[PDB]
Amino acid sequence: SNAMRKSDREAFLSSVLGNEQPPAHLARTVIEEKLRNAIIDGSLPSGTALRQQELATLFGVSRMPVREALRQLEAQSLLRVETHKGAVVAPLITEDAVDAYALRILLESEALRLSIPLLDADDLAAAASYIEQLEVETDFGQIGRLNRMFHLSLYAKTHNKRLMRLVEEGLNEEERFLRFNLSSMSQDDHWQLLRLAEQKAVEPCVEALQYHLNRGVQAVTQYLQSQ
Amino acid sequence: SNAMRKSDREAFLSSVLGNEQPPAHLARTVIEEKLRNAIIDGSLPSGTALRQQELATLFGVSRMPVREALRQLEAQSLLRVETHKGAVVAPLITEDAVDAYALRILLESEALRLSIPLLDADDLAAAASYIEQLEVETDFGQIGRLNRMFHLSLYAKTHNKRLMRLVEEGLNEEERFLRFNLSSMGLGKLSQDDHWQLLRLAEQKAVEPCVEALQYHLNRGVQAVTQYLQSQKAGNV
Amino acid sequence: SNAMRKSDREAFLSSVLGNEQPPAHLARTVIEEKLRNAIIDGSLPSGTALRQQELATLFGVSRMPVREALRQLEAQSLLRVETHKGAVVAPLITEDAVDAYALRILLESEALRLSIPLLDADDLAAAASYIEQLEVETDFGQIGRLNRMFHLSLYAKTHNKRLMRLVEEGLNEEERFLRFNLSSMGLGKLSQDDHWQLLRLAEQKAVEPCVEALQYHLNRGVQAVTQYLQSQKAGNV
Amino acid sequence: SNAMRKSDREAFLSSVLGNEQPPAHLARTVIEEKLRNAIIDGSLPSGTALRQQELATLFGVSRMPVREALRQLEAQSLLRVETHKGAVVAPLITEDAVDAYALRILLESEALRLSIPLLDADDLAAAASYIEQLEVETDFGQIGRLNRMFHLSLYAKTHNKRLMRLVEEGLNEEERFLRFNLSSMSQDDHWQLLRLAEQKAVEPCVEALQYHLNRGVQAVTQYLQSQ
Ligand code: NI
Ligand code: NI
Ligand code: NI
Ligand code: NI
């Protein structure tokens, strides 16, 4: 680490955790609790460095109770060790889904604005067919497949092969998620996307996709929190 | 496929490849060469379906020499098998470069948008240091490395791990490319002016001006790569 | 040499090696073994002159088997040729370790004296970071590397390039040693307490207290190495 | 580089060079002059980073005149490029000799305090013989050899072989220097060293050696400056 970064981190930890000195005999417990709470409510974000001497100084204690607080946080999967970083706050259970959906919004918005201008009658008919099959489908495994196919039909004229490979990969991952989880967790948005693609209303279609994916990530994260 | 698409592909293949029936003993060699020639000169574009029976029919041969031909093409990386499509014509290196840079513009612009508002004094100090090393660097190997570290410095606060893996993959690929090709590109003396502009705009947290500058920088990159690859194809290197 | 030194060496060699005259066909093997045994058990100390005629005389043989013997010893690194001295008994690994650590105490203490008053906030931040990485490190390879970087951090403002080359040579040698041997040393769980103390004293610019702590740290190092090497010699590893 | 280090360097460059903005047309010349003078008189020590943008900001100019000032400094050998550092102030011609003698003082002081306690009559006689031969020697190549031999005779009982190898190496380097340079550039100090070693006055002997080597480095650096 670097001096300015280190001092900025120390100021940040103080603003989030405070600087009250616990009794020596309460230090192990009090520090674990304050760290856990700050981690769980997001005020100490993932990737924040958890340095024994920085925390011992902040709280006016020896390193040992900090070290033993950090050990329990790791047992609880709230901290992990990374190479060149030491102990850092671990990602919350929703983080990867947030990242995944953010990336899909970036990639698919681009696939959609390349494809819409070029979609032909055959593309638009295949898309209509997939939504129509979605309307009457009851099998949860078939729902994930058809939703995938629908979204892929809108990207049928995306003319960047590297982009498309990443797009498919995200859609495959989503299908796998829905096949295994949708049981345990509405075509109007799909029709709207189709209507806007038919009209070649490119950015309105993209905006509609972003809204659709942002509802998706909210449903996924809510479900992961549920467990 | 359906009757219309099939039929259109068959007429198209005839227009590009003709329909002389080679003798049996020459069918594989004749067909491998016609398809390779047509792929390389762009007349059979990437994504074209290469179907054994369609091609056997066109050339008046059996599937066997067509299948052998297409295996040689796959071994040369001029065709790839894709699920639901079969054997299709693969993108050539120039098309792949064009798609690669378009994707880096897409990915790196978002990285910049996310990172710029959060960059700390150490990030900015690191970036300046790398440009300063670029200013006095003479080894070509080191130029690729220092260039990559500069761009990574500006993305240092991109807190999407999935996005950053793709951004880094792209930067590593560039570095590897420059590592081997830069001394053959003949670009002359290089200037740090663009890097300094990128850093200045990053420092001021001028986010869209910075994105615009990166888009210029990357579009000059793909133009340079593209020109080089055509030189290399022509044998003018 | 002169008559007295020669004569004393000759009596000494007899006291250590005896004087049985081996048969000709066994002279080389007998002599190589007696000298090697006596070198390894310390009874012929490092720096002892090994002179062909003196040894031929003692054993009642010709110079040839003595010369062959001494060549085998040189090939085993148990003797070295030095200018003005000839073939002398080489230091064994334990003596060499003892001399190496004494020299690091000498060199590193001066490095610390020169560097401590000048260390900047980035130097101190780097040092803390390395100890913090040592605290949570489980790979033995990485422990040697992180240990070396910590010590180098404290010497970061030693502005004598000749001294620093020797200091770095010593630290690289330690790292290389730990890289291969640490997992076999059985030292148990290791503590960062000494490193933190060194940094604390460096931060306060308590120069002689810091030197004293480093001297303790290095003397525990040579004791550990020495014990390990004897284990290794005994075959108790 | 790191943020705090960079800002400390910027403050340092300002205290040494000032911050007066030259006319655009004088920038190239004025900056070269101020840098050269600060380098030659030691106020910008060797290893100081010379960063085009830092200097352009300091002087309120564009990078080009700084870049062209730095290029002339390099032509004059006052700056050199180092890996991971960029352009740095180069060592002055006396720097390596200062380093060499500093290191000899460290190593030889230790050889001397290991050896003096153990020196015997034969050692002390060999040492006396070398000084006596130095007193009557007129050949400059023989003077360097005998001075070496004298100093080695005092280290005859140094019982660290690694140390001794470094010591010999420094003495060899000195002998080579004196063989080639002494022409173009006094046994009382030698006798004093011998007298103190005879008495086993260990630290006084070491102090006397340090004084001897510090006069040596002063003569060597003075001569290098002369050219
Ligand atoms: Ni959907
Ligand atoms: Ni660049
Ligand atoms: Ni250590
Ligand atoms: Ni002298």
Beta carbons of D86 and B124 less than 8 Å apart: no
**Strand B86-89 relative to strand C79-82: parallel, antiparallel, unpaired?**
unpaired
- Choose among B235, B236, B223: nearest CA to B94: B223
Q: Would you state the structure tokens that stand for residue A173, as one six-digit string? A: 């991952």
CA distance B138 to C146: 31
Torsion C151-C154-C157-C162 (CA) sign: negative
CA distance B156 to B158: 6
**What are the start-end ranges of the H helices in chain B?**
3-17, 27-40, 52-59, 63-75, 93-115, 121-136, 140-154, 161-185, 193-203, 207-234
Q: After which residues is chain C broken (C to N over 2.5 A)?
A: none
Of the listed ligands, the closest to the CA of A193 is 1
Chains that touch B (3 or more CB pairs under 8 A): A, D
- Which among B122, B125, B136 has CB closest to D87? B136
Residues A89, A78 contacting (CB under 8 angstroms): yes
Residues C120, D5 contacting (CB under 8 angstroms): yes
CB-side exposure of A174: number of CA atoms within 13 Å?
A: 25
Beta carbons of D99 and C163 less than 8 Å apart: yes
CA distance D46 to D91: 5
Chain D closest-CA separation from residue C185 CA (Å):
25
Residues C136, A86 contacting (CB under 8 angstroms): yes
Q: Which residue has the tokens 């989880």?
A: A181
Q: Would you state the structure tokens that stand for residue C168, as one six-digit string? A: 């770095």
Of the listed ligands, the closest to the CA of A127 is 1
CA distance A157 to A176: 24
Q: Could you count the other beta carbons within 10 Å of the beta carbon of residue C36?
A: 17
Chains that touch A (3 or more CB pairs under 8 A): B, C, D
Q: Would you state the structure tokens that stand for residue A162, as one six-digit string? A: 């590297």
CA distance C126 to C192: 15
Helix pair angle (B93-115, B161-185), 10° resolution: 130
Query: B161-170 in b/e burial notation, b at 16+ Cβ within 10 A?
Result: ebbbebbbeb
Q: Would you state the structure tokens that stand for residue D207, as one six-digit string? A: 């102090």
Q: Bridge partners of C86? A: C82
Cα of D145 vs centre of ligand 4, distance in Å, is 10
Q: What is the largest CA-CA distance in chain B?
A: 73
CA distance D151 to D190: 9
Cα of A87 vs centre of ligand 4, distance in Å, is 57
In C, what residues contact D, Cβ < 8 A?
Answer: 46-47, 91, 95-96, 99-100, 102-103, 106-107, 110, 120-122, 159-163, 166
Of the listed ligands, the closest to the CA of C175 is 3
Cα of B159 vs centre of ligand 1, distance in Å, is 26
Beta carbons of D86 and B120 less than 8 Å apart: no
**Strand A86-89 relative to strand B79-82: parallel, antiparallel, unpaired?**
unpaired
Beta carbons of D86 and B121 less than 8 Å apart: no
**Strand A79-82 relative to strand A86-89: parallel, antiparallel, unpaired?**
antiparallel
List C-alpha distances in Å: A26 to A56, A66, A76.
Answer: 13, 11, 20
CB-side exposure of B45: number of CA atoms within 13 Å?
A: 5
CA distance A223 to A88: 26
CB contacts, 8 Å: A52 with chain C:
132, 135
Cα of C149 vs centre of ligand 3, distance in Å, is 9
- Which among A8, A110, A160 has CB closest to B120? A8
E strands, chain D, are 79-82, 86-89
PDB experimental method = X-ray
**What are the start-end ranges of the H helices in chain C?**
3-17, 27-40, 52-59, 63-75, 93-115, 121-136, 140-154, 161-185, 193-203, 207-234
Cα of C147 vs centre of ligand 3, distance in Å, is 5
CA distance C142 to A83: 10
DSSP three-state, residue A207:
helix
CA distance D166 to D164: 5
Q: Which residue has the tokens 């480093």?
A: C214
Q: Would you state the structure tokens that stand for residue C66, as one six-digit string? A: 């003595």
Query: C80-115 in b/e burial notation, b at 16+ Cβ within 10 A?
Result: beeeeeebbbbbbebbebbbbbbbbbbbbbbbbebb
Q: Could you count the other beta carbons within 10 Å of the beta carbon of residue D162?
A: 18
Phi then psi for residue D93, to 5 deg, are -60, -20
Residues B92, A161 contacting (CB under 8 angstroms): no
Cα of D104 vs centre of ligand 4, distance in Å, is 12
Which residue is closest to A7 within chain C, CA to CA? C125
- Choose among D163, D129, D124, D158: nearest CA to D146: D129
CA distance B29 to B22: 9
List C-alpha distances in Å: A24 to A52, A54, A133, A179, D28.
Answer: 15, 17, 66, 52, 63
DSSP three-state, residue C82:
strand
Of the listed ligands, the closest to the CA of A208 is 1
Residues B111, B156 contacting (CB under 8 angstroms): no
Phi then psi for residue D120, to 5 deg, are -110, 180
Q: Would you state the structure tokens that stand for residue B91, as one six-digit string? A: 């993108």
Residues D9, D54 contacting (CB under 8 angstroms): yes
Question: C149-156 long-range CB contacts below 8 Å, 24 or more apart?
Answer: C150/C195, C151/C108, C153/C123, C153/C126, C153/C127, C154/C111, C154/C112, C154/C115, C154/C116, C154/C119, C154/C123, C154/C127, C154/C198, C154/C199, C154/C202, C155/C108, C155/C111, C155/C112, C155/C115, C156/C115, C156/C119, C156/C123, C156/C126
DSSP three-state, residue B90:
coil
Q: Would you state the structure tokens that stand for residue D98, as one six-digit string? A: 């200062």
DSSP three-state, residue D179:
helix
Beta carbons of A53 and C133 less than 8 Å apart: no
CB contacts, 8 Å: D3 with chain A:
2-5
CA distance A107 to A171: 11
Q: Which residue has the tokens 């979204």?
A: A151
Q: After which residues is chain A broken (C to N over 2.5 A)?
A: 185
- Choose among C35, C20, C39, C24: nearest CA to C69: C35
**Strand D79-82 relative to strand D86-89: parallel, antiparallel, unpaired?**
antiparallel
CA distance C152 to D118: 35
Of the listed ligands, the closest to the CA of D131 is 4
Which residue is closest to D2 within chain A, CA to CA? A2
Residues C163, D106 contacting (CB under 8 angstroms): yes
CA distance B56 to B63: 5
**CB-defined contacts B:D, below 8 A:** 39
Beta carbons of D106 and C106 less than 8 Å apart: yes
List C-alpha distances in Å: D218 to B51, C204, D91, D98.
Answer: 87, 34, 17, 9
CA distance C150 to C129: 8
CA distance B44 to A188: 41
Cα of D221 vs centre of ligand 3, distance in Å, is 37
Residue from A1, A88, A101, A103 to probe the interface with B (highest B Cβ count within 10 Å): A103
Which residues neighbour C133 within 8 Å (Cβ) at sequence distance 6 or greater?
A84, A85, A86, C146
Q: What is the largest CA-CA distance in chain C?
A: 73
Q: Bridge partners of D89? A: D79
In D, what residues contact B, Cβ < 8 A?
Answer: 1-3, 5-7, 51-54, 63, 67, 81, 84-87
CA distance C225 to C210: 23
Which residues neighbour A109 within 8 Å (Cβ) at sequence distance 6 or greater?
A206, A209, A210
Which residues neighbour B49 within 8 Å (Cβ) at sequence distance 6 or greater?
B1, B9, B85, B86, B87, B88
DSSP three-state, residue C119:
coil
Torsion B177-B179-B182-B183 (CA) sign: negative
CB contacts, 8 Å: A166 with chain B:
103, 166
Resolution number, Å: 2.1
Rg (CA), chain B: 23
Which residues neighbour D41 within 8 Å (Cβ) at sequence distance 6 or greater?
none
Chains that touch D (3 or more CB pairs under 8 A): A, B, C
CA distance D170 to D173: 5
Which residue is closest to C103 within chain D, CA to CA? D163
Of the listed ligands, the closest to the CA of A154 is 1
First to last CA, chain C: 43
Q: Which residue has the tokens 């000839």?
A: C86
Cα of C195 vs centre of ligand 3, distance in Å, is 6
Chains that touch C (3 or more CB pairs under 8 A): A, D
Q: Which residue has the tokens 């044998």?
A: B235
Torsion B144-B148-B150-B151 (CA) sign: positive
CA distance A70 to A68: 5
Beta carbons of A1 and C120 less than 8 Å apart: no
Please state the length of chain D.
Answer: 227
Which residue is closest to D107 within chain C, CA to CA? C106
CA distance B122 to D121: 64
Domains of chain A: 1-91 (1.10.10.10), 92-227 (1.20.120.530)
CA distance A131 to D169: 85
- Choose among C116, C146, C127: nearest CA to C212: C116
- Amino acid identity for residue C103 in this structure: L
CA distance B178 to C166: 37
First to last CA, chain A: 36
Which residue is closest to B139 within chain D, CA to CA? D83
